Amino acid sequence: AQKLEAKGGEMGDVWDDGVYENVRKVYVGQAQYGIAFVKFEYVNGSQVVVGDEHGKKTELGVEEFEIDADDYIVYVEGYREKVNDMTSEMITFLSIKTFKGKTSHPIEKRPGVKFVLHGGKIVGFHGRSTDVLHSLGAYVSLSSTIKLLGKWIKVEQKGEGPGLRCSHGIAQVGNKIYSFGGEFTPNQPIDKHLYVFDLETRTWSISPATGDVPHLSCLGVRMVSVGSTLYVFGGRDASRQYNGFYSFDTTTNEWKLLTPVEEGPTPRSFHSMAADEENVYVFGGVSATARLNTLDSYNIVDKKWFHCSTPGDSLTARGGAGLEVVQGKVWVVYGFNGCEVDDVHYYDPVQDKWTQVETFGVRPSERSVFASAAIGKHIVIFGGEIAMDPLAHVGPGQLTDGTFALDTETLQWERLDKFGGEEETPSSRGWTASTTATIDGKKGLVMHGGKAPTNDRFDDLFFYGIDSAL
């Protein structure tokens, strides 16, 4: 399979259970602060393999977590920390997620760093213990049976690009992809240009413009395409001043302030957006004062904003969540509310009401600001932030790299990442501007830009192309 780095203080006796067919049972014995004692019971062929213990038990006892035979571990989430002011970090908290969606303990915010051994199937463990757990890794085996077959392509680029940024917005119109807004240094919007990408040329340039050009250059902005006209909302500049709701006729190349701030929906940034041929949707994100959970629709024909039913407590205010129209319905996926979140919800237009949905099977650990597109009955997501940065949107935070698709018709998540092929899978990133797109006659996901794990920026253009079977 694949050994994953054990994560924790590198003090202690290293242990390695090796790799098995699957995991039958997990044993966790708590320490006084963190984790004392682990043990695993595995299965290999027709053989139950009871494993050695690692660390020593405490007066607390040891809790068991049995994994059904029709069932396996998709990830282990945890918290490492240097406590006692003791020379080494130790592992302080663990949660187990099961393919069937069993979960051992609900994740909680504990100080220290979060880590996660992720991806499709945990088939064994290894770590380092000194009479208590000090670090932990595991072995993951990516499942070979990838339902939504497809590959990752690093699109080449030529012109005057939007280059290196994140917290910007992209949309497709015809065979051209448009970009707008964004940040390069922490919290500093770059320009007001509307960059455009000719697919057949694979080349960039600044679009020409007319009319009501956006009043402020900004970041945390969103935009979606309807027909050949682009629609743009929110964002902020350096001075926490907000943009209203504009549009851009691409055949006409003219801007248009469709509704002013202070007229339409609450001015905000790092909201989410989508469109369905008839309305343009705006969800959540951060207002001047609070995160939001509200959603507003704007009919193009009726040229007018409608305020949708409010979800209340069921669905906590959030930003950096994914929003796609999966079918006839709006989908809210994951996001951030002080904690990173792995909620899933749909809003039904016809009824004007919200529904929560349980989801299962090799699901992503909770995360924000990821790349997302809806294609078919699927939502596809890549990367994202799996833990906020202490210093704000200022610092990198912790950023990951999985590729996942939600099947809205079965509620099975799958990880589109393969062992098997050779392809240019994007490196761990977040705050990407992402969209659904057709390129060289394949629909799929268009990742662009984003924050690096090292607080750098990216400029890459990435495409998960869904091969032809569809």
UniProtKB/Swiss-Prot annotation:
Kelch repeats lie at residues 176-224, 229-275, 279-328, 330-374, 378-433. It catalyses: a (Z)-N-(sulfonatooxy)alkanimidothioate = a nitrile + sulfur + sulfate; (Z)-phenyl-N-(sulfonatooxy)methanimidothioate = phenylacetonitrile + sulfur + sulfate; (Z)-N-(sulfonatooxy)prop-2-enimidothioate = but-3-enenitrile + sulfur + sulfate; (Z)-4-methylsulfanylbutyl-N-(sulfonatooxy)methanimidothioate = 5-(methylsulfanyl)pentanenitrile + sulfur + sulfate + H(+). Signal peptide: none annotated. Its cofactor is Fe(2+). InterPro entries: Jacalin-like_lectin_dom, Jacalin-like_lectin_dom_plant, Jacalin-like_lectin_dom_sf, Kelch-typ_b-propeller, Kelch_1, NSP1/2/3. It comes from the Eukaryota. It is an enzyme of class 4 (lyase). A (Z)-N-(sulfonatooxy)alkanimidothioate binds at R236, S269, R291, G320, V369, W431. Keywords: Iron, Kelch repeat, Lectin, Lyase, Repeat. Its EC number is 4.8.1.5. The active site is at R236, R291. If the presence of Fe(2+) is not required for the production of nitriles with benzylglucosinolate as substrate, Fe(2+) is mandatory with 2-propenylglucosinolate and enhances the global lyase activity in a dose-dependent manner. More active at pH 7.4 than at pH 6. One of its GO terms (biological process) is seed dormancy process. It holds the Pfam family Kelch_KLHDC2_KLHL20_DRC7. Induction: By herbivory. Residues 1-142 form the Jacalin-type lectin domain. The keyword Iron applies. Fe(2+) binds at E385, D389, H393. SMART domains: Jacalin, Kelch. The proton donor differs depending on substrates. Belongs to the jacalin lectin family. Specifier protein responsible for constitutive and herbivore-induced simple nitrile formation, especially in seedlings and roots. Promotes simple nitriles, but not epithionitrile or thiocyanate formation. Converts allylglucosinolate (allyl-GSL), 4-methylsulfinylbutylglucosinolate, 4-methylthiobutylglucosinolate, 2-propenylglucosinolate (sinigrin), indol-3-ylmethylglucosinolate (glucobrassicin), benzylisothiocyanate and benzylglucosinolate (glucotropaeolin) to their corresponding simple nitriles in the presence of myrosinase. This is Thiohydroximate-O-sulfate sulfur/sulfate-lyase (nitrile-forming) NSP1. It comes from Arabidopsis thaliana (Mouse-ear cress).
